Structure formats: structure tokens, C-alpha cells
Structure 1
């Protein structure tokens, strides 16, 4: 049981060993396509690639490659697309993916600039009157509105397929205070944000998989998805004790390498799930508590 295991690991201060164990046992699959010479400039990091078997393929004949993985959690019955922060030359591909995969939500866990460096291209319009057109993929993207909170922002976007003139609303959830290689300020601020994403309907099985990204699309993205999936599993069974966090993380790592980057992010995952379990099992007060503790106002 997660709560007992957590306290046991904390008492012996062996989170490093636990996390390293996961790295040791993690799946290893080929990333041949990602490593093709013609795709070098489509990758933000040399050492972070999507496995061939689970990679998202763009629906084009030229080059179908994007650094993005489909994490399909069979048991939980929810899927995520984890991807790197788009590059100046892959913003068109990013939005093509969103369109083709029928995603309704995009979760961004990083800032464009972190620690003096550019972790992600400016891939969405910052102003209503200045829409973006991606000529290579024939898509238009307009900022419709934004709801700015203290540590996160929610944007409404309109994505248009210029070829068919079909239009779709995309919800953009931007967590701006989650440090790279770090953890959220508190389980409360994290859960508050996760529930914002959930309550938008972006995770519904009626839509395509939500798109989740940070810079590399494995550390913070992995942490976010592990917590959500664990809460879902627990929800479906209404039994918190039935969820094996490490086993779920290992399952997720079958679909993309390196999910969750530090031992403390793993530890934080436990915190988030243990606290979130209160809502799952019928506590009607914790949701407001989190909102207050998060100081989103």
C-alpha cells in the first residue's frame, strides 16, 4: 500500500535507491526513426527520443516524424501523448499532431525560458489580433481568451484546418511555476492544476488523447501523467490500496523513455496521489482546500 511504502522509504531515506531501481528495470526499445539523419533537427535533445513502436506518426508522405509518444494505459483506459517542447521548425508538426489525433487539451508544464535558456518555442499566439499560420501543415491558430492565475494560465485556442476550413477549440493549460528537474510547490498546487485539466473535459475518452509536454517531455510530463493515471485506476476500482505506483510507472515507461527524471519527482508523485485519494473516496472538502492552499488568486 502506497502510504505505508512511502513512510517506509522516507524513514530509511532510500528514494534514490527506489528511483534507480525503476531506471534499472525500465523497458528499452529501439528509436531508429528518431535517430535517422534527416530527423536530427526535429529533436530537442539527442538523448531523449520516442520509441518506434509507440511514436506518433504525422499523416504526411514527406516525413512522418515527430518527437512524441502515445502512452496508452490499457487498464486505466486513458491515453496521453507526451512530447518535447516544439522547436522553431516543428510547431507546424505539433499542431498537425493535435489536429490528426483529435486532442482537445494541451498541458504545458514548463516556461518558454528556464534558467536562461529557451526550453520551448513560442508555439501559440500571445495576442488575439496576431494569429499564427503554419504554412507547412496548413493550419491557423488564434488566441480566443486566457484566464491568468498566479501560478498557471488557461488559454482557449481556435485551431483551423485551412484545407477543410474545419474549426476546433483547443484548451491550453500552462503551469508556469514547476521548476525543471524539480517538483511543484505543494501537492495542493499540483492537484488544483490537475483538477482544472480534468474539469475542462479535455481527458474524456470522447476526445483524442490529451497532449502533455515540458521541455524534454519526460520529467515533469511523466510526473503529471503518473499521478493522473494512478488516481484514475484508484477511481475505477474505488480502492486506493489496489494501486501499485511503481508498477504503473514501469508500465508507462514501456511507451516513452525516462518518465519522471528525479527521485524527488517520484516521491512527489506519491504525495500527490495519496492526497488526491481523499477526493476519489468521497471527500467533498479537499478540492476547495487545494484551491485555497494553491493561492491561484
Structure 2
């Protein structure tokens, strides 16, 4: 059982050591499309690239590239698109991907500004009456409603395909209280947030995959998917205690590099799953 494994790594302070074994064991696949010169300004970080085998392709004939990966968790029947915080030049691409993949929900785990730097473009409207048009991708985006709470904000946006006049409801779930440094002290507000995303239907197989991002789409984004998948596997399996976080993380790392950036994020992931299991058991 992971609870016992937690006290062991904690009492022994072996987190950096566990983390390094995961680093060592992690898959490595070509990312040739990311590294093409024409795609240099579509990447926020030069060392964070989608693998070619799992990358999302835009349906635009010119350049099909976006820094986004499909994570398919076969046993849990869960898919996620992990992407970087959009750049000023990729906000159009980001909404094209949401449209093309039939995503219901966008999960945002960062603030637009952290540590006095811009971590993300402002890719959604701030007021009902001031909609955004993405001329490059022929999409219009309108803020319908905004529900601001202590730890997160839920926004009801509407996506309109200007080419076809189809419109769709998109839910934007914005976790606003992740600290600039380290991880939250308690996973309570993060779990509440995750249950709120689940309750919306945004993670359900009726819909395209949820889009999850932070700045790079590997650290906080990783913790989100890892906690969701692990909790679902504990509901699905005959023996809940057969669920090994480390194995789940390594399976997710076949789809996108670097998921969980620090030994602190790994410890927090354990804590979130252990705590979440009490509500589930």
C-alpha cells in the first residue's frame, strides 16, 4: 500500500532518489516535428517538445504543429491533451485544437503572471461584451459567465466556428491558488477542483479529451492527470492497492516528456491520491 510507501520515503527522505529513478527509467522518443526551424516560435521552451508519435496535429494544410500531446490511459478509459500555455502567436492554434478535438473543458493550473514574468497569453475574454476573434483560425470566443471562488474560477465560454456558424459551450476551469514556489501545503483545494472538473462531464468519454495546461504542460499538468487516473484505477480494480503511482507516471511519460518536474510535485501527487482515496474508500 502507497500510504506505507509514503511514510517510508518521507521518514527516509528518499524523494529526490525515487524521482531520479523515474527520470532514468522514463521513455525517450523522437520529437522531430517540434525541432523543425519553422516551428521554433510555436514552442514556449526549447527543451519541452511533444513526441512525434503522440503529438496533436492541427487540421490546417500549411503547418499542422502545436506543442500538445495526447495521453491515452487505456485501462482507466481516460484521455487528456497536455499543452503549453499558449503564446501570443499560438492563441488561434490553441482554440483550433479545442474545436478539432471536440474538447468540452480547458483546465488551467497557472496564473497569467507568476514570479513577475508572463507564463501564458491571455487567451480568453475578460468581459461579456468584448469577444475575441482569431482571424488566423476563423473562430470567435465569448465569455458567457464567470463564477469566481476562493481557490478557482469556472468560466462558461462559447466557441463559434465562423466558417460554419456552429457554436459550442466550453468550460474553463482555472485553479488560481497554486503557489509561485513549491506545491500547496494541503491537497484539499486541488482535490475539490479535480472533483469539480469531473462533475462537469469534461473528463467523460462522450466528449473529446480535456485540454490541461500550465506554463510548459508537464509539472502541474502532470499532477492533475496522474491524480485523476490513479483515483479512477482504485475504483475500477478488484484490489485498489495494486495501483502503483510510479508505474502510472511511467506509462504517462511514454506520451509526453517530463510529467512531474520536481520531487516535491511527486510527493504532492502521492498526498493528493492518498487523501483522495479516503473520499473514494
CA RMSD of aligned residues (A): 0.9
SS state of the match for residue 241, structure 1? helix
Shift of 1:75: 1.2
Deviating above 6 A after TM superposition, structure 1's stretches of 4 or more consecutive aligned residues are none
Q: Residues of 1 paired with 2:227 and 2:239: CA distance?
A: 15
Task: Give SS of 1:71's match.
Answer: strand
**In structure 2, C-alpha distance between the alignment counterparts of 1:150 and 1:166, rounded to whole Å:** 34
Counterpart CA distance in 2 for 1:185 and 1:247 is 25
Stretch deviating more after TM superposition (172-181 or 218-227):
172-181
User: Structure 2 regions of 5+ residues with no counterpart?
Assistant: none
Q: Which runs of 5+ in 1 are unaligned?
A: 282-297
For the residues of structure 1 that align with 2:230 and 2:222, how far apart are their CA atoms?
A: 12
Structure 1 contact 181–220 (Cα < 8 Å) conserved: no
Q: Deviations over 1:161-197 (max 9, x none)?
A: 1111101000000011113562124111110111111
Deviates more, 1:196-205 or 1:182-191: 182-191
Tell me, what secondary structure is at the counterpart of 2:67?
strand
Q: CA deviation at 1:48?
A: 0.5
1:105 Cα deviation (Å)? 0.3
Q: Offset at 1:260?
A: 0.4
Cα pair 1:147 1:155 within 8 Å, conserved: yes
> Helix, strand or coil for the counterpart of 2:158?
strand
Asked if the contact 1:67–1:84 (Cα under 8 Å) also holds between the matched residues in 2, the reply is: yes
Give aligned pairs, total: 281
In the TM superposition, residue 107 of structure 1 has moved relative to its aligned partner by 0.2
Q: Secondary structure at the match of 1:75?
A: coil
Tell me the alpha carbon deviations over residues 239-283 of structure 1, each in whole angstroms, 9 at most, x when there is no partner.
4302010000000000000000110110111111111112222xx
Describe the superposition over 1:103-147 as per-residue Cα deviations: whole angstroms up to 9, x where unpaired: 000000000000010000000001100000001110000000010
TM-score w.r.t. length of structure 1: 0.93
- Mapped to 1, the partners of 2:278 and 2:99 lie a distance apart of 35
Q: Deviation string for 1:64-106 (max 9, x for gaps)?
A: 0000000001111100000000000100000000000000000
